[PDB]
């Protein structure tokens, strides 16, 4: 699954992304 | 693990919950009912 973490569009438009229980070496800065 | 089925982890780990119970237990051994 893929989840999007946002502070709210009334604060910012930046976003972070969680790839759930996926090893972070096979996803396709801060990893 | 499976087909479209996943298990999400709880927000509090087991370490955090054991920390909470040791804080309750040290509060009661040492202050009685005053800390609540
Ligand atoms: C939402 O926007 C309004 C006006 O743009 C502002 O007054 C309010 O503080 C904002 N809320 C947050 C949580 O930033
Ligand atoms: C992801 O794969 C690498 C390569 O084998 C491994 O070293 C790493 O431990 C894996 N991730 C986790 C969370 O174990």
UniProtKB/Swiss-Prot annotation, chain A:
Q: Which residues are glycosylated?
A: 10, 23
Q: What does this protein do?
A: Attaches the virion to the cell membrane by interacting with host receptor, initiating the infection. The major receptor is host ACE2. When S2/S2' has been cleaved, binding to the receptor triggers direct fusion at the cell membrane. When S2/S2' has not been cleaved, binding to the receptor results in internalization of the virus by endocytosis using host TFRC and GRM2 and leading to fusion of the virion membrane with the host endosomal membrane. Alternatively, may use NRP1/NRP2 and integrin as entry receptors.
Subunit structure as annotated in this protein's UniProt entry: Binds to host ACE2. RBD also interacts with the N-linked glycan on 'Asn-90' of ACE2. Cleavage of S generates a polybasic C-terminal sequence on S1 that binds to host Neuropilin-1 (NRP1) and Neuropilin-2 (NRP2) receptors. Interacts with host integrin alpha-5/beta-1 (ITGA5:ITGB1) and with ACE2 in complex with integrin alpha-5/beta-1 (ITGA5:ITGB1). May interact via cytoplasmic c-terminus with M protein. May interact (via N-terminus) with host bilirubin and biliverdin, thereby preventing antibody binding to the SARS-CoV-2 spike NTD via an allosteric mechanism.
Protein name (Swiss-Prot/TrEMBL): Spike protein S1
* Native source species: Severe acute respiratory syndrome coronavirus 2
Annotated gene: S
* Shown segment, full-protein numbering: 594 to 642 of 1273
């Amino acid at each position: 699954g893929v989840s999007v973490i946002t502070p709210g569009t009334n604060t910012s438009n930046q976003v972070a992304v969680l790839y759930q229980d996926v090893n972070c070496t096979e996803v396709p800065s801060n990893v | 693990k499976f087909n479209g089925l996943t298990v999400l982890p709880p927000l509090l780990t087991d370490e955090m919950i054991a920390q909470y119970t040791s804080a309750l237990l040290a509060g009661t051994i040492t202050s009685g009912w005053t800390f609540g």
